From a paper:
Here, we show that a group of class A/rhodopsin-like orphan GPCRs including GPR61, [name] and [name] increase the cAMP level similarly to fully activated D1 dopamine receptor (D1R). We report cryo-electron microscopy structures of the GPR61‒Gs, [name]‒Gs and [name]‒Gs complexes without any exogenous ligands. In this work, we show that the high constitutive activity of [name] can be attributed to endogenous lysoPS, which occupies the OBP of [name], whereas penetration of ECL2 in the OBP of GPR61 and [name] possibly contributes to the high constitutive activity. Here, we found a group of class A Gs-coupled oGPCRs named caoGPCRs show extremely high basal activity, compared with the other oGPCRs.
Residue numbers in the entry:
A (entry chain C): 5 to 340
B (entry chain D): 9 to 52
C (entry chain A): 27 to 219, 266 to 338
D (entry chain E): 1 to 127
E (entry chain B): 12 to 61, 207 to 254, 265 to 394
Amino acid sequence: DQLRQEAEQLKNQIRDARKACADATLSQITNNIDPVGRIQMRTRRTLRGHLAKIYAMHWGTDSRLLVSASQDGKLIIWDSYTTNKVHAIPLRSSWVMTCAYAPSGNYVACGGLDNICSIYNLKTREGNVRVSRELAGHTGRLSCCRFLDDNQIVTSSGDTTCALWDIETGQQTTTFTGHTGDVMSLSLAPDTRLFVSGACDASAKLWDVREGMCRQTFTGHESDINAICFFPNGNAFATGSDDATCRLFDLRADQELMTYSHDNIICGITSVSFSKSGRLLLAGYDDFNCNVWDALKADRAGVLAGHDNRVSCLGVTDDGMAVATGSWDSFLKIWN
Amino acid sequence: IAQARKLVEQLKMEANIDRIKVSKAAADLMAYCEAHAKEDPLLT
Amino acid sequence: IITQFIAIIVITIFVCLGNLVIVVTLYKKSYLLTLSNKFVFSLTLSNFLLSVLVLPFVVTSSIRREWIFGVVWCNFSALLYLLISSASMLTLGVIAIDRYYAVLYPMVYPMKITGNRAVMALVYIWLHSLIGCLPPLFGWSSVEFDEFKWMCVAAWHREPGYTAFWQIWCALFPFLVMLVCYGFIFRVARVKACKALITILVVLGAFMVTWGPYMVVIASEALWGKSSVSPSLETWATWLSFASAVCHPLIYGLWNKTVRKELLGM
Amino acid sequence: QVQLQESGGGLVQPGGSLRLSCAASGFTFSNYKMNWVRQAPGKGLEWVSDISQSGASISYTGSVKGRFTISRDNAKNTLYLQMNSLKPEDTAVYYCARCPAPFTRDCFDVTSTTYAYRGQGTQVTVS
Amino acid sequence: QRNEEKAQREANKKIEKQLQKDKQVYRATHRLLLLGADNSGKSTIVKQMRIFETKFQVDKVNFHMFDVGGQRDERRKWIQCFNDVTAIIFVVDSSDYNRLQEALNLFKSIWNNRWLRTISVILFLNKQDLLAEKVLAGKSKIEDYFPEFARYTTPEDATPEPGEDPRVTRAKYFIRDEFLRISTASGDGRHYCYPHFTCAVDTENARRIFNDCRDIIQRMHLRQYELL
Ligand SMILES: CC(C)CCC[C@@H](C)[C@H]1CC[C@H]2[C@@H]3CC=C4C[C@@H](O)CC[C@]4(C)[C@H]3CC[C@]12C
C-alpha cells in the first residue's frame, strides 16, 4: 500500500509539473501562421502484384527503391519510378507485420507472428537474394523492425519488449522492458541514438539504445496505440490509436501537444508517418481512407481515398518527394 | 512486489527529468517546419 | 418510318458506349482480367467492333433505302455482323459455363478452370463463330441487302438450310447452355437461401427478348418465304438483334460487383 | 493515463448486500462497453457481467443472474454492481474493465496476467 | 542507360511470371484460423487430420490451419491478421461449464469483430463424451452455471444420436443454441456459424471443415454474381 501511495504521489507530481509547463496550447500559438489549406494528392502509380494484404512498407535511403511485405508470403522490392519489381523474396512465414530496408540498402528485414526477424542480404555476388540472418528470442510477435546500420537492428515485440540486436553475433545486445501491453510500432530517431515505442497500454516510451533504460514515458490515449514515428527533428513523435485520434508528443515537453480527431471519425488508426518538413501527418485509418493532418492546425488538409480496404502502410521518402499507401486490398499506391 | 518496485523506480526516474515550456516546444516544431518548408514538395 | 431509323440511331449509340466503356475499363487495368472478365472483355470488344464496322452502314442503308457501298463491302459487313453476333451470343454460354463451375464446384474452380483453359475457351468461341460464318465464303448461300432488315446479311429465305444451321449452331447452342447453367445455379441458390429468380429471369430474358424475335422472323422467312412477316415486325426484330449488343455488356459488366466498382470509380 | 478506481466491498455475511461502484477517468465513458470481472482466490479471472454503451444491452454470468444487477452512470462516469443474497463463493477481488475498442460490441478483457485497462479492484469477502 | 532499362524489363517479366505462378498457387489454398483455449482439444483436432502451421488436403484442395499459440493471452491485435482466412475454426470444451462463459464471450467478440464479421466461424463443441459423463453423473448441474437451462426444452428439429440420454441431448443442444443465439443476433447473413458435435476420437473433422468452406465459397460466389 505504501508503494502504491508513493507511485500515486509521483504521478501527481508528474501531472503537476506537466500542467506547470503547459503555459499555452499548440493550436493557440500556431493560429497566427496560415494553414496549408486543402491538399490534393493523386495516385501517380499503383504498385500492384501483391496477392494479399500488405502490413508494412519502407522506403530506402535511395528514394526510388521501396520494400513491401504481404501475407501472401512476399517481400517485394520495387523501383518506384518505373513500377518494376526489382526483387521478390519469398518468406518462411506468411504473416509478416513489419519489414525494413537497411540504410546502406544491402539488407532487408521481415518479422511477424513467427517471432523471428529474418534479415535478407540483397547485394550478394551469387545472384538471387538469400537469407542473411535470423534473430530469435522474442517471445511475442514482432510488430516493427528498424535498422540502425548493417549490424544494429531494433525490433519491437508483442510481449511488451523491444530489443537491440547485433546482426553479426545474432544475440540480443540489449533488451528494453517496462511496457505493460503489446508494443505495436517503433521508430528510430534521425540521430539514431533514441527511439520511441508505442504499446497497447496507451503508452509511448522513449528508450536510449546505449543505456537500455526507459528514458521517458508518455500517456494520454484511451486505447491501443498502433503507430508511432518521430518528427523530422527527432524531438517529437505522433501516435495514432484505436479511439480514432492522433496525439503529438514532444520529448522535452514530456506531455501531449495536439490532438487530431473529429466526431465523424470512429475507426481506429493503423499507420502514421511524417513529411520532411513535419508539416503533414499522414495517418492511415480503418475507414479505407488516409488522412493528412496539419501539425499546426490539426485540421484535415486532405483525404487519400483510393483503397478498397483499410490502409495499413504509410511510407514517406527520405527526400520527401513521394508517399506510398499500402492497403489490405493487396494494393500499394504512390501519391506524388 | 518486484513490479511495484520497478514502477516506483521508473516513476522516480521520469520525475527526476527536467522539462521545458510548451511554448518553446511549439516554437521549435513550428521552426523545424518553416525551415524545411522549401524542401518539402508535398506542401508546395 | 423515321421512328424505326430513330431507334437504331439510339441502339447503335448504346452498343458503342456500353461496350467501349467496359473494354477500356478492362484494358486500362489488367488485374480484372481474370477468366471471367476476359470472356467479358472479348464480348464487349466484339460488340464494339460490330457497332463501329457494321451499325453505321445499317443506319446509312436504312436512311438511304438502298445499299451504296458495293458488293465486296456488303459481303464483308454481313460476314462481320454474323461473326460478331455468333461470338457475342456464344460468350454468354461460355460465361454461364464459368458461373456454373464457380457456383457448383467452388473448391476445384481455381484448378478445373485455368487461364490457359480460359484462353482455350476464348479461342474456341471465335473458332465456333467462324465455323458458323464461313459458308457465306463457301457460297452455301448469299449475302444481299434485305430491304426490311435494312442491311445485308444472308438470304435466309433463299436458303432455309443455312438459316436452320445458323439457328442450331450459333443461336440455340448458346441458349441451351445459358439456361441449363442458370437453372442449375438456381436449384443451388434457392436451396441455399427471391433474388435468384430476378437475376435468372433478367439474364435469360434479355437474351430471349433481343434474339428470339429475329429467330422467329428468319425461320418464317426460310420456311414460309419472304413477305410472311410484315416490314415493321422484321425491322424491329433486326433492331432487337442489335439491342442484344446493349443487353450483353450491361448485364455482364455492371451486374458484376468488381467491374462495376472500378468502372464507377473511373 | 486511464484510471479505474473501485470503491465498496469488505466483509459481508452470507445473504447480505453490497454496492460496488467504480469511477473511471481518462477517457469518454459512454463509448466503451463496461464489464465487471471477479477473481476468486486460487483461480483466474472470471467475467461476471457487462453493460453496453447505452445500457440497453445487459448480460450476466449465469451463476450470478438475478441476484446481481449492473448499472452505468454516464453523468458520474461510473459503473455500479449491486450484489444481494450473497454466497460464500462470491468472495473475490472485483475489477471493472473497459473493452479495448470504443464503439465496438467485441472485446478481449479477461486476460490472465495483465490487462491495461482494468481497475485495481476491491476485496469482497462473504463469511 | 537503355541497357539498364531493358535489363530491368526482363527482371520485371521474370518476377511477374513468378507472381502469376504464386497467385495460381495461393488462390488454390485456403487459410483457416484455429482458435480456442486450454482444455480445448485444438491439438487433438490438429493431430487427428495428421504448431504454428498445419497442412492438410481434402479432395485435392489444400487447407492450411494455424494454431497461434506462441503469444500472450491478449488476442485483439494478432487476430486482426486473420481476416482473409476462409474460416475461423473455434474449438471449445463443452464439458467445462465454469470455462464455458469465457468461451461464449470469446465467440461473441469474434462474431462481432469488425475484421471478423465477414469470416464465418466453424464451431467445434469438442469433448462431447466428457459433457455426457458430467451430466450423467449429476454432481455438477448446468443450472448452477446457466439458470436458463432449467427452462430450456429440446427443439423439435434436433437429431440426437440414437441411444442417447435425453438429458445429454438437452445439454448439448442447449450450449449449441447458446452459441447460435450469438451467431444469429447480428449475423446479417454474410457469415454463418456451423456448429458440430466433435469428440477427440473422431476422424471426419477435416471433411466437416471442407464442406463448410465449400458452403462459404458457394455463398460468396452467389454473392459476386449477385444471385443472393
Ligand atoms: C429485356 C430485359 C428483361 C433485360 C434486362 C435489361 C438490363 C439492361 C438490366 C437488367 C438488370 C439491370 C441492372 C440492375 C442493377 C444494376 C446495378 C446498378 O449499379 C445499376 C446497373 C445495373 C447493372 C443494372 C443495369 C441494367 C440491367 C443490367
